[PDB]
Ligand binder design. Structure first.
Ligand code: HEM
Ligand code: HEM
Lengths: 481, 481, 481, 481
């Protein structure tokens, strides 16, 4: 245009200057009607949004999922039908640290995967562990607070962390996994991902299986030592973010193979470990892995904030053929994510490009702040006599199950082999090597250093419950100093 | 898709039912993981946004502006060059009432006009009056609060309104206009619009004129009586909204002619009324109207909320060739609108379709909640060595003026004919007819009924200052009851 | 202080002027560092908060509840033990109109009552009707949207309202009540309040009764005609608000008597009308009213916004001895209110004085915006070893019940006398008088005027289902015009 | 109370369990009406607020300021009158990193000090440097973005930082200070604080001086090496936060002495360095330091979030006797802080206990979200006839100055010794030691490693402009690798 200057204000008119304010002479005050200054500063002041809680610190990439086996006998979901290729988005993260925190702290890592399927966005929001610390969502707020900062000093605190874990012994399986080698992945490319929960798969005939998801890295599982991780935390707080971005940019596209475990509907009720208990794995002897397909990440974001920070994943984002399960943790998650995203991003978070599905949305939601894609004169109510369609399926849902009882607050009933310490003990005695046990003792003793004496004594009892020998070695190492 | 049901959730998957919740059997409780119920209720709960303050209650339409005369000697603005046609949006409103308040209350009406020009959105945010009640923005918050509700009872209150007006005698010109016939327009189609403020026009050679805008209705000015307006308020609270929507729908497209008054830069400093005082008109004897063009409204909104409620107008939205003026009220407005819109709508209010310009925006603003149109890897700083342009014009701005003095808080200096009551007195004695004066006395006496005695006595003095005779008639009518 | 000026800025320093802005000389521009101007305008721009949806328009008063009978055999709740006196807050409202809408429109009225009890705030959030239009919360968003504005024009629309009601015939009982005399209360003092839902009462021995609440006005039930209500809507949009405020100010304190109906736990499952269906009343022949006590309103708010607009009521605010019931509508409400209030007011809405309980709050919630009353160094997790207490009751809850079934979306099962039109027909034929039936025909025919022909035909069928004779009279009146 | 359980919900009623959710039998789904679960999760999801931008990462303490000298000849401010003792709050921070970022990165440190004075909160919001990188606020948004993350990868980037600095050569003085020893303080206790800007002091007779503030640590200035800082960043990201909290807890109370430089009003216009240019120091030869008093920090926060994270400091928080100056940067800050705080914390941020003044606030601001301390029935407008006071001082303000010119966007005029590189050159050649110059060369060469070649070449030219020798050594070190 004839009056252009190189940039505009928000109304599209020339900005005049991005470098100097509007003043009364060169020595005078800034005037109130420097609207370019006001607009740019007001926007700057509103750039930051609340960080996620948990999983604030993370990054990710786009890719593709390709089905390479036939699992139509287990699910009718379009995404998993033979040959299907689907675009994906994967965000990796740590659990406890804030936006600016080092990537190489000892922590659980998130593995949040979206499939842009032809029947909607399917989100599989997993971790780099098959289990979690808890089995009821009422405890989750407590757990995450115990992993963050003391209320007075603003410092993370080992006493608080161990006080919570030792008073919640359901934590023992995941704490063992976390304190083992896998607590410190070398890169996100060299860790596995897991759904952790049991999900329901429903086939075209209406038959149900309980499934676990396992994403096995084709780059192998590789871990850092405590010393190596500390050093990297000081040298490069964004070590994992950079590693992923630079690997993809140079064409070194990471891959994972997806396998499921499939338990028949009726055997879910009788298996010796509760499949609806998030602190339990399903033995690969009883239920071996079945191959589904391969995930590849092959495209970096163009804008990290718009495509990764503003991405909103939810386990509630199921597609036909895939349902939730009786797992209390999973049912808590069905509520919590969308709720957080309305505050963190806004009411219309799911209209942002990264969160939009590929298929047509026809949803009964109107108005609200920042409504970019309005529904014109579509009817706002159902049934209507205006030809604007609605859903009205009645009766049992395809992805459901049964329940019976009185309203209660209590622990899940124990199956034959259920307890708090058994699987942890197997991991320590049978899965770890001798050298991994030595490292484990050092890791756990390091973590208990400076823990208040009463809590430290409870931690020794906890580790002896996991394994009498490991527990004694940890106590001896702590007392040796 | 094969599993469709008639509508979707927000992730695009089938909703299953828009009519029944997910329960444990037909008689059981609703389950927490009824995510369709949660999403639709959470969205419903976030549909309402803060109403505008002031001007909450309003509606509008799209149209066109066509230049039919040559005013290139006064401005280089593209919108006003010979022959130019521009799409427009016009929102009409009342000042004091809330979202659900009757259209036919006695009030100032807003006349908010946007031109989608080739060099950006130009907003002329006017009223149905050429003047306003005040001449310094510090008093505006006080004024609007006095026009709303008492803090204890939540009732509008005549005592509060007259207490403010009589203690702020600058109000007299606009209060006279408001209490006259034009306080009650029959329809928005039958009222005039005015910029009210003086604006600066700059031509291609850099010469400046001070201008006033006058939009003269081609449907004439027609008004209701007090009794007629009261009756309509009870029968149809949305009388004006409906009138406009139904007039356009049946092809009865309303029109206004735009005229300006143009005062040479140097005569602005010497004119006998202060052109930078928003309580003053410029006499049509001294500065006659010059025709510019014609505004037509010819298209109803498709979605009232997205296109009218979410529209964000600002006097700060100037285009090259048009600037603000020394008027303190106008300079206050340059800050206030954008600020309100960041809270009312959101940081990215100007990315909503109705607020987007027609030309390319290249603005240094990134991130924030609800960022729909991201800037990819564009540089976030200036100067940069990446070929992402910026503005850096130095020296006096084209749409500026001079100032000199010490930092002060005080009234504007009086010109030869400036005072608080003169122009009001002219309106009453010379512009109104005899019958309009009779109606005026009745209107003002009605408004003063039940005003607390000390404030009512100050109101009699105020009206006698406007005109000794009108004031005595008002006092006599009030005392007669 | 020695430098005082009459008012302060937000930091407590002298404001200097509430009336003039800071300028470069008397004729110069406003400077950016007029911080008093900025602060007052930025606050002004953030004064408005989202209106409630529904029930935007309302007002209320404080009072007292006094138990005058013995109902300890039905509940252990402290509020209802013999002799107990409790402070109360009552907010009245209409359902569909916005903040500025006339009080005297035909509508359901809200009757929202809080008791500040010694074991927490007990909220009984009722209406001026014992029933509602719907029995599943999934339909509530649809219903409220159908009662508001068309998406294109922003007008309320009779076709939309009747299209929703006739396609949802469960609506017939409440629509009959609404179109009858009680749709237009003369004052809030002259209407009854009802809980509408069945609630659970639990006594000290753990025995359960299902209860309905009935608040019978001691001023009687008095109603306006259509013509009278229209006239008042034009003359005084705040007629009910003013009536209540002025009645209390002059010592005319309104009173209601509270009665319950009490159904034994086991008879709830077998009664011939479903007590868990919000469209049904419980016959006073089967279950007569039992007197509890008297509510009096005797104190106006000191600040309407802080004490009434910012009040946050929720059916989830139960106290020991009182629980929710299997009613799907009530269980939907347990989620929805708190969710809306977090957006409308803020995360810490329940720390505002009006929403705070009288007893000590010891809640596991920390941080968030606007945290006025912080918890110092209290532990943020449970169990802790720091002596900060927590709750851990296990097993069946005292205020619970049983369920069994598969996850389904379907209508509640019908009891012996359940249907959509029976109770409506009783209200029309047996409860109304002859003159009330004549008025009813006129009201309903008036409401159907200008309803689109296909929807109007469905409305005639609907009214004939209610009562063959009333339906024919309505059709004949509509066709007569 | 008789039904207590150990904790409450938000309404004060017993929570029943903080550890288990409400389910249909022990194996069943969670019910929607688990309101304790919903409330605790909804609050958890709203705990995080937007981090500050800049200065996200910080901590602080309470203390006292004691005047020990007589400066009444320079100011009438109550806080600085002989003998006066005032409570203080001090927040320390880094500029560029996010909430979780290591304390021991090379950066400017903030020194934000509040005095709770008897005439309002006085905020002196300083840095650990007397200068800044820029002299016009229009460039500040650009600068801070260049110090944060690349838009595509989310990585901090040396090229972006040096591209901005070398294209903005006004940056040279502060960049030299930053790349010197003081870029890495050992603890916050061992750094100085400075106002950086010139402020105006006005005495009881109305005489003005331009002042600079200098807070000289009584613990001395001590710094880390690059290697030491890197190591600590990996071992303890919260090293400075912990150091301060633990020093105060053990009674090792840090102290600073406050000195001012005082330039007579008229000499401000003629001094050879522009005192209104934030990139310039005032020579201690021309204007020696004058002692005022001593700051001590002696009390840790009880709640870090409520007292430190939610603290809202602003340079606009002046008190009588202290004003802003012509410095464009300072005038930009007068707007920006309050604006950011309305979004970050909320409209009523200044009612939170930490932000409240000690004296009585009488401010014309009403309503808004989260209004804890309402104004009852106080008048909402001025003048009023209700005895609610207001300010109306007219004429020149006590803390003002003069201006004259046309509206312009351009660089400040140069004084006799003003340029971009002179003071930087003095710091390098005269203030640093030989060993500090060696470390400087290593620091700057390290920072330029991997900077894109075109930008690196501009950086060599920039450092040669600072000092021909230092610049050549830096170039040689970079090329040596
Ligand atoms: C009851 C337990 C849990 C609750 C209440 C919960 C809640 C949340 C919330 C509120 C967020 C932030 C969402 C946002 O702002 O966008 C989040 C993020 C996340 N959660 Fe959970 N969570 C739970 C358990 C788990 C489990 C068991 C896993 C893995 C199996 C998991 C994996 C994640 C991941 C990967 C993210 C980050 C997603 C992303 O990258 O955006 N969480 N969680
Ligand atoms: C210093 C004086 C004034 C201030 C501080 C002020 C401020 C405001 C604010 C904050 C809004 C709401 C903006 C939004 O949320 O989108 C508004 C709306 C409006 N103002 Fe003003 N105003 C002032 C004077 C005037 C004057 C003098 C006129 C006419 C000449 C005017 C006409 C309007 C109109 C028409 C609207 C509604 C715009 C729309 O339809 O969206 N105001 N004003």
């Amino acid at each position: 245009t004839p009056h252009a200057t190189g940039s505009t204000r928000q109304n599209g008119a020339p900005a005049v200057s991005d470098r100097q304010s509007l003043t009364v002479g060169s020595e005078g005050p800034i005037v109130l009607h420097d609207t370019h200054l006001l607009e740019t500063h007001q926007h700057f002041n509103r750039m930051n949004i609340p960080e996620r809680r948990p999983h604030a610190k993370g990054s990710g990439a786009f890719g593709e999922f390709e089905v390479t086996e036939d699992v139509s006998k287990y699910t009718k979901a379009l995404v998993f039908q033979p040959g299907t290729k689907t675009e994906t988005l994967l965000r990796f993260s740590t659990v406890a640290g804030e936006l600016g925190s080092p990537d190489t702290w000892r922590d659980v890592r998130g593995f949040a995967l979206r499939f842009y399927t032809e029947e909607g966005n399917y989100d599989l929001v997993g971790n780099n562990t098959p289990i979690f610390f808890l089995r009821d969502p009422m405890k989750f707020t407590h757990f995450i607070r115990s992993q963050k900062r003391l209320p007075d000093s603003g410092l993370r605190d080992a006493t608080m962390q161990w006080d919570f874990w030792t008073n919640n012994p359901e934590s023992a399986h995941q704490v063992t996994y976390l304190m083992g080698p896998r607590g410190l992945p070398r890169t996100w490319r060299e860790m596995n991902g897991y759904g952790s929960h049991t999900y329901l798969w429903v086939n075209a005939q209406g038959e149900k299986h309980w499934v676990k998801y396992h994403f096995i890295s084709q780059q192998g599982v590789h871990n850092l030592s405590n010393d190596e991780a500390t050093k990297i935390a000081g040298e490069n707080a964004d070590f994992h973010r950079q590693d992923l971005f630079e690997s993809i940019a140079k064409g070194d596209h990471p891959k994972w193979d997806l396998y499921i475990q499939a338990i028949p509907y009726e055997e879910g009720k009788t298996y010796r470990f509760n499949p609806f208990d998030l602190t339990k794995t399903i033995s690969q002897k009883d239920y071996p892995r079945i191959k589904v397909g391969t995930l590849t990440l092959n495209r970096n974001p163009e804008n990290h904030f718009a495509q990764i920070e503003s991405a909103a994943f939810s386990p509630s984002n199921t597609v036909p053929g895939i349902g939730l399960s009786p797992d209390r943790m999973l049912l808590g998650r069905a509520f919590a994510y969308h709720d957080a995203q309305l505050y963190r991003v806004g009411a219309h978070v799911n209209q942002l490009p990264v969160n939009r599905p590929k298929n047509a949305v026809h949803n009964y939601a109107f108005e609200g702040q920042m409504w970019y894609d309005h529904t014109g004169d579509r009817s706002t109510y159902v049934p209507n006599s205006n030809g604007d369609s609605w859903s009205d399926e009645t009766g049992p849902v395809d992805d459901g199950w049964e329940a019976d009882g009185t309203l209660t607050r209590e622990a899940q009933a124990l199956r034959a082999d259920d307890d708090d310490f058994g699987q942890a003990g197997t991991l320590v005695r049978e899965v770890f090597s001798d050298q991994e046990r030595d490292d484990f003792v050092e890791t756990v003793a390091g973590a208990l250093k400076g823990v208040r004496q009463d809590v430290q004594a409870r931690a020794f009892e906890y580790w002896k419950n996991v394994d009498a020998t490991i527990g004694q070695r940890i106590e001896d190492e702590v007392k040796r100093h």
